[PDB]
Amino acid sequence: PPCTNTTAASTYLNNPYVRKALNIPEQLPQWDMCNFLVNLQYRRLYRSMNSQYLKLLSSQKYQILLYNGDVDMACNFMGDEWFVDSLNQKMEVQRRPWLVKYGDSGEQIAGFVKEFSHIAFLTIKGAGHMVPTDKPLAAFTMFSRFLNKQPYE
Amino acid sequence: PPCTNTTAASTYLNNPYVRKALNIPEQLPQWDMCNFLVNLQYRRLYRSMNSQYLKLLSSQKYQILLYNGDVDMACNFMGDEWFVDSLNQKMEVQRRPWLVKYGDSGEQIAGFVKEFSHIAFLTIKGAGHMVPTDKPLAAFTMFSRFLNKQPYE
Amino acid sequence: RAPDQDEIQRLPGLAKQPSFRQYSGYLKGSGSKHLHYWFVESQKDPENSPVVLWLNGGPGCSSLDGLLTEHGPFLVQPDGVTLEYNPYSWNLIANVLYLESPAGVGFSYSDDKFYATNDTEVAQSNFEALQDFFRLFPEYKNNKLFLTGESYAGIYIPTLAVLVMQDPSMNLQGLAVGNGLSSYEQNDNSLVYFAYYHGLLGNRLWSSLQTHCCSQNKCNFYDNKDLECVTNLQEVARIVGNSGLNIYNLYAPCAGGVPS
Amino acid sequence: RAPDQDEIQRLPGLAKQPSFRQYSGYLKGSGSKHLHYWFVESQKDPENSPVVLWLNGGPGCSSLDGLLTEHGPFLVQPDGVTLEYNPYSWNLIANVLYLESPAGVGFSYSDDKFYATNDTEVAQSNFEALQDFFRLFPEYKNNKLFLTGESYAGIYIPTLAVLVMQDPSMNLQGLAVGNGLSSYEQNDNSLVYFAYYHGLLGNRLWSSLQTHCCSQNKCNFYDNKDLECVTNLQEVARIVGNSGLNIYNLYAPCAGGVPS
Numbered sequence: 001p002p003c004t005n006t007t008a009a010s011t012y013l014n015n016p017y018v019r020k021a022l023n024i025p026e027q028l029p030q031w032d033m034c035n036f037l038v039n040l041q042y043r044r045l046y047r048s049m050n051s052q053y054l055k056l057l058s059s060q061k062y063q064i065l066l067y068n069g070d071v072d073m074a075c076n077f078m079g080d081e082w083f084v085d086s087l088n089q090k091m092e093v094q095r096r097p098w099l100v101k102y103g104d105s106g107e108q109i110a111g112f113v114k115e116f117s118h119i120a121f122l123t124i125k126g127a128g129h130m131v132p133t134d135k136p137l138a139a140f141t142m143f144s145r146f147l148n149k150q151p152y153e
Numbered sequence: 154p155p156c157t158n159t160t161a162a163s164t165y166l167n168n169p170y171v172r173k174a175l176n177i178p179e180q181l182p183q184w185d186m187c188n189f190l191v192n193l194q195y196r197r198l199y200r201s202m203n204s205q206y207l208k209l210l211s212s213q214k215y216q217i218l219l220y221n222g223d224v225d226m227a228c229n230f231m232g233d234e235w236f237v238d239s240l241n242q243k244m245e246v247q248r249r250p251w252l253v254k255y256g257d258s259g260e261q262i263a264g265f266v267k268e269f270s271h272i273a274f275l276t277i278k279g280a281g282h283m284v285p286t287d288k289p290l291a292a293f294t295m296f297s298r299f300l301n302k303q304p305y306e
Numbered sequence: 307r308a309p310d311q312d313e314i315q316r317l318p319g320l321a322k323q324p325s326f327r328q329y330s331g332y333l334k335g336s337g338s339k340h341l342h343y344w345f346v347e348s349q350k351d352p353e354n355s356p357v358v359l360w361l362n363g364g365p366g367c368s369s370l371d372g373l374l375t376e377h378g379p380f381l382v383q384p385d386g387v388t389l390e391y392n393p394y395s396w397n398l399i400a401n402v403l404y405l406e407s408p409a410g411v412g413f414s415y416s417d418d419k420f421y422a423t424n425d426t427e428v429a430q431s432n433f434e435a436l437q438d439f440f441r442l443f444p445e446y447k448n449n450k451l452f453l454t455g456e457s458y459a460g461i462y463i464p465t466l467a468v469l470v471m472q473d474p475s476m477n478l479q480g481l482a483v484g485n486g487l488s489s490y491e492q493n494d495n496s497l498v499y500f501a502y503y504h505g506l507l508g509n510r511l512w513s514s515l516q517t518h519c520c521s522q523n524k525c526n527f528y529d530n531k532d533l534e535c536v537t538n539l540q541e542v543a544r545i546v547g548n549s550g551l552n553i554y555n556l557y558a559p560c561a562g563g564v565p566s
Numbered sequence: 567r568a569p570d571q572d573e574i575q576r577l578p579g580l581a582k583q584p585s586f587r588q589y590s591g592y593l594k595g596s597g598s599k600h601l602h603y604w605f606v607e608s609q610k611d612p613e614n615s616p617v618v619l620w621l622n623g624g625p626g627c628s629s630l631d632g633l634l635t636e637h638g639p640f641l642v643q644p645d646g647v648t649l650e651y652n653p654y655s656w657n658l659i660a661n662v663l664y665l666e667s668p669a670g671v672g673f674s675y676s677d678d679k680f681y682a683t684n685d686t687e688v689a690q691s692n693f694e695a696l697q698d699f700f701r702l703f704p705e706y707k708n709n710k711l712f713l714t715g716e717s718y719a720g721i722y723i724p725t726l727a728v729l730v731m732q733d734p735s736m737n738l739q740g741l742a743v744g745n746g747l748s749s750y751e752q753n754d755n756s757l758v759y760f761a762y763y764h765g766l767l768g769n770r771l772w773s774s775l776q777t778h779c780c781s782q783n784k785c786n787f788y789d790n791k792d793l794e795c796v797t798n799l800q801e802v803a804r805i806v807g808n809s810g811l812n813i814y815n816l817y818a819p820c821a822g823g824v825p826s
């Protein structure tokens with residue numbers, strides 16, 4: 001993909017001793033971050049996940065989280081905020097900022113949370129496409145709150 | 154001002170030996186980054202700089218530059234881009250990105266330039282309110298091109 | 307209890323041995339597909355910690371990117387030799403299953419080498435791979451299952467979750483999608499607005515977009531048939547993804563510099 | 567030729583002596599105003615380099631912030647003792663005049679201690695200060711003059727430039743304004759749009775703003791008399807500048823943390 005440097009991971013995973021430690025059969029071709037041939041041959045079928053999410057929310061057994069880094073342009077935060085809102089779920093909560101405790105810098109706004117029953121949309125302020133790479137502490141805090149079914153604030 | 158830490162500059166300028174080196178009379182009160190009493194007593198008279206800029210542009214003797222860090226919310230880039238465009242000047246050029254050569258990272262987009270005759274609007278990508286603090290190299294490159302009356306691209 | 311054939315004993319580039327158990331092998335997908343997985347057990351109480359599946363997007367990109375560059379227990383350094391422990395690793399509180407999917411992605415493969423696939427096929431193949439994971443790791447069958455992913459996994463995860471929800475043996479508790487593709491229409495419409503309000507497009511291009519793509523208060527930047535609209539959206543596409551701006555992080559530099 | 571009374575000999579916190587000459591003293595403004603200046607000569611050919619005036623905004627904030635934290639020859643370190651040379655200093659190619667203005671700002675003062683002022687008074691006082699600078703530094707009279715500034719200096723600079731343009735002795739060549747206040751209307755209207763498209767406001771607050779502040783295609787977030795509009799704009803004002811977000815850099819932390 002453009003503007004990305006994948007050399008470090010590519011150099012590591014293509015090392016023969018790394019492949020042996022990872023139990024990779026020797027005959028297999030070299031490791032590429034993204035397989036161009038798979039992408040080219042891939043037939044995209046769905047245009048919207050609306051029905052899939054409504055099917056998952058109907059059971060009321062699953063906690064759903066859609067999180068976006070607000071400085072990403074590939075899959076921007078607004079597209080996903082609109083999507084979550086369009087699902088029109090019960091128990092709509094007022095949009096609020098969510099906090100993260102940074103070392104000695106104190107409590108900081110890590111982004112904004114829009115919550116409904118069994119579904120929440122989250123922004124990660126200053127993060128791009130790869131949220132845990134850009135904001136690792138904010139990504140962990142969000143992940144921890146998601147697993148434990150805790151409010152994101 | 155909120156969310157700003159001015160302690161380092163305040164600690165330095167309030168040192169008695171610094172004041173002596175700067176030829177400051179000893180009787181004068183302590184140095185404050187922003188004087189609250191001056192702000193409180195200040196009477197704001199102008200609501201727009203439209204007439205001032207049109208008066209300066211009428212002579213065709215001066216090069217005008219309005220530059221904004223695109224992540225600032227106090228005096229955001231769009232307000233100033235609208236302003237420059239609203240002046241409706243001759244020799245309108247197509248909006249283009251402007252480049253900066255970073256160490257070994259190569260040529261990067263430092264922002265976008267909107268040029269007219271004797272006036273140009275510039276964004277500084279990733280910079281806030283204090284452009285030279287956040288993007289010093291991009292700020293110097295822009296400043297150098299401005300003084301030398303060179304295109305910003 | 308666990309596949310001892312798949313367990314990683316000593317991983318190169320690590321200065322310290324992991325406190326947790328880790329596995330690297332193959333899960334059986336649909337037909338003749340063998341999906342490479344890298345499973346990292348929880349650093350704190352793996353037996354009671356949730357099982358989390360991680361899928362990277364593309365389509366065609368590896369979930370090993372997620373491990374070594376995003377939220378894995380160790381991260382690859384610029385030398386491409388050294389791995390350094392991540393203090394914000396997702397495996398601190400969860401058993402994380404990174405799956406290279408579909409077949410052909412990274413170390414994943416198929417016996418027929420036929421890698422032409424679709425959304426429905428990938429969901430079914432990922433479901434069969436999940437069934438195979440629980441066969442190889444029976445001690446994790448009753449553990450809380452979470453399906454997570456990024457980008458195109460916005461399609462991978464909900465389609466997979468609909469199949470998982472029909473399996474009573476799988477303890478599905480939830481799903482998380484990072485910067486995911488949920489709707490092509492919503493993504494394309496919001497991006498044009500994102501590009502203008504982030505100062506990438508000027509008032510001239512925006513006025514032309516608002517006049518030729520929009521009606522009253524609503525805008526169509528997705529499937530608009532208007533002549534100038536297609537031309538203007540192509541200029542936006544050139545500015546956003548082909549001018550030298552990093553589409554993945556607007557304020558980050560573009561690796562390799564601005565193109566010629 | 568130059569005020570030797572004002573020249574800085576040895577500045578504390580500097581590990582190396584400057585290659586350029588620097589001055590710190592007072593310029594006479596209007597009435598009984600004494601404006602403190604810090605003039606840093608060009609590092610490369612000061613005699614032919616342009617004269618650049620720098621003004622910080624507020625109103626009431628010091629131009630010494632611009633020197634020690636922004637684009638000065640040396641920058642104050644977190645210890646508040648050490649000064650480190652700036653390789654991107656604006657004085658590498660220009661003679662930079664940092665002026666603490668109006669009276670009362672930083673080290674600037676007035677003999678009557680009366681600091682109540684206005685836009686027209688500050689412009690006239692800054693013009694008299696500029697005339698005083700050329701009296702103290704006659705060797706710079708014929709040098710290219712540039713008037714620069716930040717924030718409220720978006721008012722300071724163009725008002726000053728209109729007075730400077732009427733003086734034939736001043737070699738005015740141009741003006742540069744950084745994140746400046748050019749129009750209250752344009753700034754306020756654009757900020758509401760900036761806050762929504764940067765994900766600070768939700769669809770509920772935005773829909774309410776678009777319905778109660780806007781008509782057809784045009785929006786009024788500046789002087790709107792509408793009831794809910796004033797209420798909604800006050801909520802925007804609370805989110806943007808009073809919630810814990812850094813108004814000066816959206817993606818930077820708020821110094822001192824989020825308020826109680």
Ligand SMILES: *[C@@H]1O[C@H](CO)[C@@H](O[C@@H]2O[C@H](CO)[C@@H](O)[C@H](O)[C@H]2NC(C)=O)[C@H](O)[C@H]1NC(C)=O
Binds near residue numbers: 011383384385561
């Ligand atoms: C792309 O990434 C690679 C790997 O991170 C970069 O190469 C490294 O460069 C540094 C500095 O010269 C060295 O210390 C590392 O040892 C290099 N690693 C490898 C594997 O060669 C490379 O410079 C980057 N390229 C661009 C254009 O950004």
Ligand SMILES: *[C@@H]1O[C@H](CO)[C@@H](O[C@@H]2O[C@H](CO)[C@@H](O)[C@H](O)[C@H]2NC(C)=O)[C@H](O)[C@H]1NC(C)=O
Binds near residue numbers: 043045426427
């Ligand atoms: C998605 O891919 C699957 C697998 O390649 C397709 O399903 C197979 O289609 C062939 C005919 O082309 C049949 O012989 C197989 O029996 C099908 N398999 C299954 C499991 O149904 C499927 O048609 C593709 N979908 C689309 C819309 O292209």
Ligand SMILES: *[C@@H]1O[C@H](CO)[C@@H](O[C@@H]2O[C@H](CO)[C@@H](O)[C@H](O)[C@H]2NC(C)=O)[C@H](O)[C@H]1NC(C)=O
Binds near residue numbers: 164
């Ligand atoms: C505000 O700024 C001051 C000055 O930069 C900070 O104080 C410094 O803290 C570091 C780390 O503890 C010390 O090495 C410096 O010597 C301190 N300088 C001074 C002058 O005390 C202070 O921590 C900052 N406060 C906040 C809330 O961000």
Ligand SMILES: *[C@@H]1O[C@H](CO)[C@@H](O[C@@H]2O[C@H](CO)[C@@H](O)[C@H](O)[C@H]2NC(C)=O)[C@H](O)[C@H]1NC(C)=O
Binds near residue numbers: 686
């Ligand atoms: C801006 O401030 C100036 C100076 O304080 C005001 O001008 C003076 O006004 C007093 C009366 O209040 C007169 O006695 C002086 O002769 C005026 N001086 C000059 C130079 O004109 C001015 O009125 C203020 N402007 C506004 C609109 O408040």
Ligand SMILES: Cc1ccccc1[C@H](CC(=O)O)NC(=O)c1cc(=O)n(-c2ccccc2F)[nH]1
Binds near residue numbers: 001002006037367371
């Ligand atoms: C940006 C990136 C880097 C490394 C790994 C994955 C990705 C992402 C997916 C993710 O965030 O999980 N990739 C893309 O956004 C993307 C779009 C696209 O067309 N590709 C791609 C796929 C196969 C071959 C080349 C490609 F560029 N990759």
Ligand SMILES: Cc1ccccc1[C@H](CC(=O)O)NC(=O)c1cc(=O)n(-c2ccccc2F)[nH]1
Binds near residue numbers: 187190227624628
């Ligand atoms: C943000 C800042 C820090 C340090 C110095 C100046 C400033 C800026 C002005 C500039 O960028 O040049 N200040 C403001 O934006 C600002 C608005 C405002 O009300 N003040 C202010 C003025 C006097 C007293 C307290 C203040 F907060 N300061």
